[PDB]
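Lecture notes, unit on binding sites. The following record was shown on slide 14. It pairs a sequence with 2-oxoglutaric acid.
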Amino acid sequence: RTADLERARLGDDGLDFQDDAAQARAFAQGVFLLEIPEWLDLSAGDRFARQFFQGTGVEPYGKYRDLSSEHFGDELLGYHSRVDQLEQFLLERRFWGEVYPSEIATLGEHLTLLSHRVLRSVLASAGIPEEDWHRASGGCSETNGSYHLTFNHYRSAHQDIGLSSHKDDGFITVLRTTAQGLEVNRDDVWEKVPVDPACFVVNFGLSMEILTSACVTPLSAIMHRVSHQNFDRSSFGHFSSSRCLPGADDGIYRYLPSAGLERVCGSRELIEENDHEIYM
Ligand SMILES: CC[C@H](C)[C@@H]1NC(=O)/C(=C/[C@@](C)(O)CO)NC1=O
Ligand SMILES: O=C(O)CCC(=O)C(=O)O
Ligand SMILES: [Fe+2]
């Protein structure tokens, strides 16, 4: 019922697991734990996740309930009530400094850098040539990707599942969870992800799976869900995707030594299709 995940930490040369077999298990499973740097403050983000849905009466973050997608010219952004228990506030990096509270934008920038370092370590381990990283990652091997800082609240009063079974769209997801509910389907059995408030949960998205499908050890996008919540639950995540601007899409690529990078689809196209798959 409970999954046992490999634990890593960011070191001087990148991702440090206990050994090479632990990294090989972690990358093949598509999910692992990443120790949270002692200097990285998560307390403002935790409070934002507990508050964003409550409206302007609740300070300092309740007012973000009133910011819908029309405010951003991007239908994916802002407050969203989902068909599951989940309600969300999603915002891409181009809007953080202007729209998010100053300390929330700061959290997003720091998570972008941690995710940047995690991704470059992964691309090296997958055997992708370094000179192809920028195009292969749609900019995420540097800081030119699309990055969403997304806050999640599970309304326990709503029936049925917390968040439907799915895979993330992008390359790297850095997930901050302090309560039970997350479940992963490694192999073919659903398993609870253990709670560890000292670690992020890291997993790969669909773009990573597509990118590394022909590699020596292909990396998969883990299927995961949030079980029905009988009490309220909150969380937040940092998502790294190939640059998917409404007018500036970087596309999704498969790497093959015999051919280089072959375009598969567009980045926003993958996101819109996935959101349609996730919520039936
Ligand atoms: C790349 C932009 C998207 C919106 C980003 N990637 C995801 O896979 C996503 C999935 C859900 C389950 O959280 C949305 O319901 N969340 C995000 O923030
Ligand atoms: O809330 C969680 O623990 C998981 C949320 C999630 O998987 C997502 O928002 O994509
Ligand atoms: Fe997810």
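Take-home: Residues 138 and 243 are 5 Å apart (CA to CA).
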